[PDB]
Ligand binder design. Sequence first.
Ligand SMILES: *SC[C@H](NC(=O)CC[C@H](N)C(=O)O)C(=O)NCC(=O)O
Ligand SMILES: *SC[C@H](NC(=O)CC[C@H](N)C(=O)O)C(=O)NCC(=O)O
Lengths: 237, 237
Amino acid sequence: SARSLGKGSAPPGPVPEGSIRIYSMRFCPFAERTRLVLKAKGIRHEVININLKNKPEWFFKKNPFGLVPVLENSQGQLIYESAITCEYLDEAYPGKKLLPDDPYEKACQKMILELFSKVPSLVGSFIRSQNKEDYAGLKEEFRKEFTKLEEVLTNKKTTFFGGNSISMIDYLIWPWFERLEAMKLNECVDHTPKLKLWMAAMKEDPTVSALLTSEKDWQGFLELYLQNSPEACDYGL
Amino acid sequence: SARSLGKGSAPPGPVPEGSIRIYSMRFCPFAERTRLVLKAKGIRHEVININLKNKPEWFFKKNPFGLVPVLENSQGQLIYESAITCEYLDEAYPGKKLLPDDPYEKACQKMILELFSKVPSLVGSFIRSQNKEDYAGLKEEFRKEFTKLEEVLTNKKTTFFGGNSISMIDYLIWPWFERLEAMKLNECVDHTPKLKLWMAAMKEDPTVSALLTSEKDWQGFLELYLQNSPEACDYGL
Ligand SMILES: *SC[C@H](NC(=O)CC[C@H](N)C(=O)O)C(=O)NCC(=O)O
Ligand SMILES: *SC[C@H](NC(=O)CC[C@H](N)C(=O)O)C(=O)NCC(=O)O
């Protein structure tokens, strides 16, 4: 059922009322953001994984850009860009907010995201390293970004980036830290103690824990993906 | 009074109650976003222009990144990143909202901004053109981005990107269109009729009209700026 839909597949039917659909990919960190928010808020939904290495033409009808995540509701409304989909889920569904109601406090989570916005691009450049030298230079680049984040916690003195309770901002940046390990880039959070504790507190989170992927699974996915295999997204099936 | 503060200047005192301060630069399009929102919502504020070519060390205490815009309120709270400052102003101050209350409708303005996010970087690359050839190639790049925007209006069939009434999203992208002219890049909106009408409807806006800068002024600023003159930001004084 978790199997992806690729070229030649038939476009899905309408989203049933009382449920929201997310076009995803099991190993995509941007879509994990959305899925983490979906679990945290206990929102009923269905998932359609997209074969990003061999995607269905009808998908661009879902997102002009052709990327995941993408949400589709019963009214047929489509929303793309992970952060937008997340902010949307927090506003449109019941439950405790993941984002503060307070303007300044909310703007802070936004500024922290800006602070981290460089990591996803670094992770891409990293996964493409070749020798110990490229590697060393990549570790220093991640190192500079990790300090920007440690200062926030340093200043705040709270467990999570938005307070003592986990919130939107934590879920938004977590996926990339989740892969830190499998990517052999942990000796980058050594000089950043609090950030390292944060990673430990996050893994203890029920929502985070329920969606956490195995290193062997991500390792298998990356092998195929880096090879451009139309089977990558379905690693493990 | 509009004169900028540069290296050696003294850090400003507290922001008086009932007023919000914006660290700006008269020719910065990102800060114009904030200033447009400030005018539209009729928010009392003071402006401190920053000499970006020769900025005061104390400013990094305002924004770690060292860029404008940046808002500072009486409680001493600092908020950076133009879009964040704008969203903040809409939520924290009285008046008609510039952003919709409806989650999906709000997410749409956000998706349109994503759609335009490539322009600011193109404008930078453009202002750095040298010959008619670079120029021609730049016109085609802007051309592709303008169509993405014309389709939205095409689909919506409304005057402005968020409806028949101007709203947040219009103000967010306007500054770059404002400079289109002075940058000799108008023959890019020819193949995009509706977008061209939008530009005309925007210039008719009282808020937009009150903050619109002269072509000769921006031309003068750019001459100095491109030269890295510590006087650029103060062109005209
Ligand atoms: S993780 C898989 C890719 N998704 C994104 O890059 C999402 C980026 C957006 N800016 C966001 O949602 O935040 C993806 O769909 N790749 C397909 C491709 O061909 O690029
Ligand atoms: S327009 C002058 C520059 N501002 C920005 O680039 C703001 C970019 C942010 N992403 C935003 O507010 O949206 C600026 O301050 N330049 C100074 C410099 O030295 O770069």
